[PDB]
Structure 1
Amino acid sequence: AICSALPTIPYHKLADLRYLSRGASGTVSSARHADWRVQVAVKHLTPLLDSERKDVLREAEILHKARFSYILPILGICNEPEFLGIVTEYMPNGSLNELLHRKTEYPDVAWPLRFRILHEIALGVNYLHNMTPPLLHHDLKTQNILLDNEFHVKIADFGLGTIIYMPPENYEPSIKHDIYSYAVITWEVLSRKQPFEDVTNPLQIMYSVSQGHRPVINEESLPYDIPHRARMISLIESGWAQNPDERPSFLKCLIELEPVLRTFEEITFLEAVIQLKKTKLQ
């Protein structure tokens, strides 16, 4: 009964555009609003076909209808004959991929921060699932997860390399789908390692996973230093099971994770974040 219309931001109110990152889904730039006096990110894509506009609008309204504390907050759409793009909050620290694999800038990443990030990811995906109707991500990657000033998760890219996160039952030309990806991410988050490093052709990855093989679980990929190691390992291995029905919903995962995050003090999170900024500063 209570509807809210996504504001249409005029293009000429967006100053200081700068290419932030290009990718398959389009190009993302940074800008600042003339009236709101705040920084924002803009995702855009020749003239515009009607299908392209329809897909961009689908994505924008999906962001608008799934507003949650850990879902990328959309601010408005810029829809003009000259330009068309989605406006959202600017996430300075970029994607989780950079955080994980930029060991020069990010030498250490305290376990409290890693687990808080995992928890917020699960929370975002679970809220998307608990919508009506249930909203399916169908494409979770360490590149979709953006991190704000305090390294809090913000998920993006919900609507219609990238093979690491695909369940085996999709090779043959669902809710469980998403959890699979999540499991993988957890692995890639506790190890800071590329899944299937030794494999050079992605079809090798597809073959190994279709044979029921997953990334290595050993002493090197996951050190014993990792907190709550055994629970995380059980969660991961059951979360990427060959059979979809055996994979748990995100609510079971949240119930399993909450006591894990509960062992970290509130201040240790900020300590890890500020230590990360300091190691990156020096």
Structure 2
Amino acid sequence: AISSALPTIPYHKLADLRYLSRGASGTVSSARHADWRVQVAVKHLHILLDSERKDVLREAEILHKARFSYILPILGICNEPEFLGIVTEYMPNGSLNELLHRKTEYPDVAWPLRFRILHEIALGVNYLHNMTPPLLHHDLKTQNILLDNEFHVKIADFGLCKWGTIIYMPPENYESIKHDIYSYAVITWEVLSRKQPFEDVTNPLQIMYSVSQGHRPVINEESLPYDIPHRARMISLIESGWAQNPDERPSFLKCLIELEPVLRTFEEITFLEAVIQLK
């Protein structure tokens, strides 16, 4: 049984600790490690409770166990009297949300990159489902799909995972291994549309009411234009992914088997050309 312990990092090694974003999960800051000479991110708490400390230790244990090419690499934990935080690689290219919706900043996200992003999310979630015991993310949303310096996907935010918005939640969870694939489908719709799901709906409960009656983000020529590569296959994958009956949604293994032939139609250089075009 080959084991490794998550390193502990003294707070004083984390220089230039500057705020990046607050959230529900906690506050995320950028720093640089004095010994290692690389920029890092730290997720920490707003400046010392008991079961708050339990939650962070849990998430850090998970990240450490879930290490994978498409999962945010934990570098260590800061564990001290005054300060508690998870230290990971800094993701300089933001989240997928920002990529899709900041259209002035990113007017062209070429198709090959979008497909790669969808492929890599799938590979990341699939890995988690294939752990023993399976880890279910249960909070997949475009905000939690971070993008590295090369625009590769790192999945983040393991606060609601089991060994804010409801747009990505399947109808049955309003009061299951088929949750993540539902979230995935909506993300797939979002990525291919660059639209907000249910854009023309004021109230979340109106969405929930509609979703529980079988309605889904709209699929027409306006949402998903006719020039999308593999439009028809992608629409099937979306529609099965978010099917009303959870039993009718695919496993991520099935999903990946559907994606592989699509991803193979993109030459490797077109991903690089896609990334270079971006800000």
TM-score grouping bracket, smaller chain normalisation: over 0.9
- In structure 2, do the counterparts of structure 1 residues 264 and 46 end up closer, same or farther at CA, with 3 Å as the change threshold? closer
- What is the Cα-based RMSD across aligned positions, in Å? 1.1
For 1:75, what is the secondary structure of its paired residue? strand
Is contact 1:136–1:158 with CA below 8 Å preserved after alignment?
no
How many residue pairs get aligned? The number is 276
1:102-157 deviations in Å (ceiling 9; x for gaps) = 00110100000000000000000000000000000011000000000110000011
Task: Identify unmatched segments of 5+ residues in structure 1.
Answer: 276-280
SS at match of 1:30: strand
Q: Any idea what the Cα deviations from partners look like across 1:69-115, whole Å, max 9, x if unmatched?
A: 00000000000001000000000011100000000110100000000
The whole-number CA distance in structure 2 between the counterparts of 1:41 and 1:231 is 38
1:75–1:87 contact (8 Å) kept in structure 2: yes
Q: CA deviation at 1:175?
A: 1.2
Is this contact kept in 1: 2:8–2:79, CA < 8 A? yes
Moved more, 136-145 or 160-169: 160-169
8 Å CA contact retained: 1:121, 1:153: yes
Contact 2:240 2:249 in 1 (8 A): yes
Tell me, in whole angstroms, the C-alpha distance in 2 between the residues paired with 1:242 and 1:52. Answer: 35
User: Structure 1 residues 47, 92: closer, same or farther in 2, change over 3 A?
Assistant: closer
Secondary structure in structure 2 of the residue aligned to 1:112: helix
Name the CA shift for 1:21/1:110 in 2 (closer, same or farther; >3 Å): same
After superposing on structure 2, the runs of 4+ consecutive aligned residues of structure 1 that deviate more than 4 Å are none
Please state whether the residue corresponding to 2:75 is helix, strand or coil. strand
Give how far 1:47 is off.
7.6
Question: Distance between the aligned counterparts of 1:201 and 1:134, measured in 2?
Answer: 34
CA distance in 2, matches of 1:157, 1:99: 18
Segments of structure 2 that go 5 or more residues without pairing to the other structure are none
Match in the other structure for 1:153? 153
Does the 8 Å CA contact 1:62/1:159 hold for their aligned counterparts?
Answer: no
Specify whether residues 67 and 46 from structure 1 end up closer, same or farther in structure 2 by C-alpha distance, changes over 3 A only: closer
The percent of aligned pairs where both chains have the same amino acid is 99
TM-score (norm 1): 0.96
Write the deviation string for residues 216-252 of structure 1: whole angstroms up to 9, x where unpaired: 0000100011000000000000110011000000000
- 2:104 matched residue in structure 1: 104
Q: 1:112 to 1:50 in 2, by over 3 A?
A: same
Partner Cα distance (1:262, 1:72) in 2: 25
In structure 2, distance between residues paired with 1:158 and 1:23: 13
- Which residue number in structure 1 is paired with residue 120 of structure 2? 120
State the 1:162 CA deviation. Answer: 1.5
